Ligand binder design. Structure first.
Ligand SMILES: CC(=O)N[C@H]1CNC[C@H](O)[C@@H](O)[C@@H]1O
Length: 339
């Protein structure tokens, strides 16, 4: 089988029949995991094994950014710094910050792969304007050039463990005031101002950028539709102007900002019509199931190529080997000392 366009979640720490029904649905492409899905490493590994036993082509992801966004923080998962801490380190020693960024990405990726997870929805490329509380310390730095090179260094670390990446929230959640979880944010700048600064890391990363999540933010001088529902942002700018060929994942359609798109099924249709390859529907698996069964038909072949490319590459070390690996051990020591 081949992956569908919907990324949803499972009900708990072990798979239920309802989960297995949803996982088997042709429109399912992925699972996103949250803190409630984690008791310990052994339980998590068994959960991801069982998910792949139902659907072998499934993508498994998690939000592991560090700082305030890190779902697994116990039983041996390394608590990672907020990305803002890396920008602060850069302001003292640029080269060391890049070295530390790579170590963070390697630890991050290697620990997740040891538990059977394909990817993390990282890095945040939002610029640290200071305007956005929802982003806040999740942003690397104010300067798009600095964001770019730190994110690139992080992504390199991810790649060393065979893990891809996902830049977010395109074209930038950093300038807008409001929190898209609970309201619909706006950004009234010109297209050109947005392109010159907030979009610049997406453009400069080139092949070091594997995927994008777009913001549920309305950029009122560019398009009346939030970015994740906007063909202007997703096709004209991202695919067109930037020539990006990686996967586009919608931000979570359960977020309040996304009700600007309609019922869940209507919003999903709109995100995919706009240019998302996958849509996230989090924290309401039965509503996700209505989406799975109601989605309007579309061409998906181009999307499927991109989705398959998000699967982790090559073999991962299990925990019992990772814990003795000098590279892993070295990275741990560097993170400890440098911050
Ligand atoms: C704007 C914002 O913080 N969105 C987050 C929440 N929605 C879906 C995922 O959990 C995560 O990757 C997103 O970054």
């Amino acid at each position: 089988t081949t992956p569908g366009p919907v990324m949803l979640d499972v009900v708990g720490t072990t798979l239920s029949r309802d989960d297995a029904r949803r996982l088997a649905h042709p429109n399912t492409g992925g699972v996103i995991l949250f803190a409630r899905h984690f008791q310990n490493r052994a339980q998590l590994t068994a959960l991801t094994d069982s998910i792949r036993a139902v659907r072998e082509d499934i993508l498994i992801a998690v939000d592991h950014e560090g700082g305030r966004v890190q779902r697994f923080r116990t039983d041996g998962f390394t608590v990672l710094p907020a990305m803002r801490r890396l920008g602060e380190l850069w302001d003292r020693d640029v080269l060391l910050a890049t070295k530390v960024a790579t170590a963070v990405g390697y630890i991050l990726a290697a620990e997740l792969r040891a538990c059977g997870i394909d990817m993390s929805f990282t890095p945040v490329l939002d610029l640290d304007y200071g305007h956005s509380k929802v982003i806040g310390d999740r942003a690397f730095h104010r300067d798009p050039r600095v964001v770019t090179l730190l994110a690139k260094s992080l992504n390199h670390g991810l790649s060393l463990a065979g893990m891809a990446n996902c830049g977010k929230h395109f074209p930038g959640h950093g300038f807008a005031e409001a929190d898209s979880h609970v309201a619909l944010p706006t950004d009234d700048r010109t297209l050109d101002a947005i392109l010159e600064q907030d979009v610049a890391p997406y453009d400069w990363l080139g092949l070091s950028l594997a995927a994008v999540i777009p913001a549920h933010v309305i950029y009122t001088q560019v398009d009346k539709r939030p970015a994740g529902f906007s063909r202007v942002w997703l096709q004209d700018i991202l695919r067109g102007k930037l020539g990006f060929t990686g996967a586009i994942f919608s931000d979570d359609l359960s977020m309040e900002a996304a009700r600007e798109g309609g019922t869940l099924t209507q919003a999903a249709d709109a995100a995919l019509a706009a240019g998302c390859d996958m849509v996230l529907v989090c924290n309401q698996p039965d509503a996700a199931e209505v989406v799975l069964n109601g989605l309007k038909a579309r061409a998906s072949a181009e999307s499927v190529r991109r989705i398959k490319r998000m699967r982790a590459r090559g073999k991962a070390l299990k925990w019992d080997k990772l814990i003795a690996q000098p590279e892993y051990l070295q990275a741990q020591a560097l993170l400890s000392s440098a911050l």
